[PDB]
């Protein structure tokens, strides 16, 4: 009931035990949108990689898609279970839409 504009995506990353929770919204053509995580070893010169190409100790859950008041929210959990292995990694949540891309970084 807040009488203010809605900002999208308003990307946010929340932490819980062993987990990063990314959330963001999309309003325009929400069916063409997706969220995914990326990671980069900032200690090495290896490229940015998809989560599934990092080997053991990490995984991302399927995105959860909800809608309310005409706005779709996407949420995606990244589980980092080997925090030693990924201590020097930069993680990035990406939300892609038809209007463009939004990204937010986080570190352990």
């Amino acid at each position: 009931g807040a009488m203010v504009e809605t900002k999208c995506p308003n990307l946010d990353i929340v932490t819980s035990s062993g987990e990063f929770h990314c959330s963001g919204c999309v309003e325009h053509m929400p069916e063409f949108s997706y969220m995914y995580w990326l990671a980069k070893d900032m200690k090495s010169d290896e490229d940015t990689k998809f989560i599934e190409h990092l080997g053991d100790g990490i995984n991302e859950d399927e995105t959860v898609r909800t809608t309310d008041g005409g706005i779709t929210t996407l949420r995606k959990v990244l589980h980092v279970t080997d925090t030693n292995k990924f201590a020097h990694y930069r993680f990035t949540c990406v939300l892609t839409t038809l209007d463009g891309v939004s990204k937010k970084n986080i570190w352990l």
């Binding site: 063409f32 997706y34 995914y36 940015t48």
Partner: protein, 145 residues
Amino acid sequence: GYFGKLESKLSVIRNLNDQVLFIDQGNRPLFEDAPRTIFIISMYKDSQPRGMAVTISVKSEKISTLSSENKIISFKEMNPPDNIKDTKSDIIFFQRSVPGHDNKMQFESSSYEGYFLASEKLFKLILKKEDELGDRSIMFTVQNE
């Protein structure tokens, strides 16, 4: 960096004249006033995020994938792969909402920046440097099946 396949949508694609894109008997992407009209738009995540990356494919006795190779639009006989290792790819297009035509789509070649899928009058799908604002020929209606 590289691309990874995510979900697909079955799609009918129409140009500004309300003509439907189809793959003809010669594997040419044409527009006309049914399975050769059902396109599969597959979304890809990108390790170098730049926009919504897609492949466009069609099942008509085997699967054909749209290509912008050699700056010509054609179909290649292949499944859109689960990973694309190239930073630019002949089969990847960036799909956008059209500025000022908020219900319409445009598809930029990832291989040739600023070149777009366009309807050209046969009515052909062609690849087209956008030279002018509000060029309707690069605008598409993408309807959900």
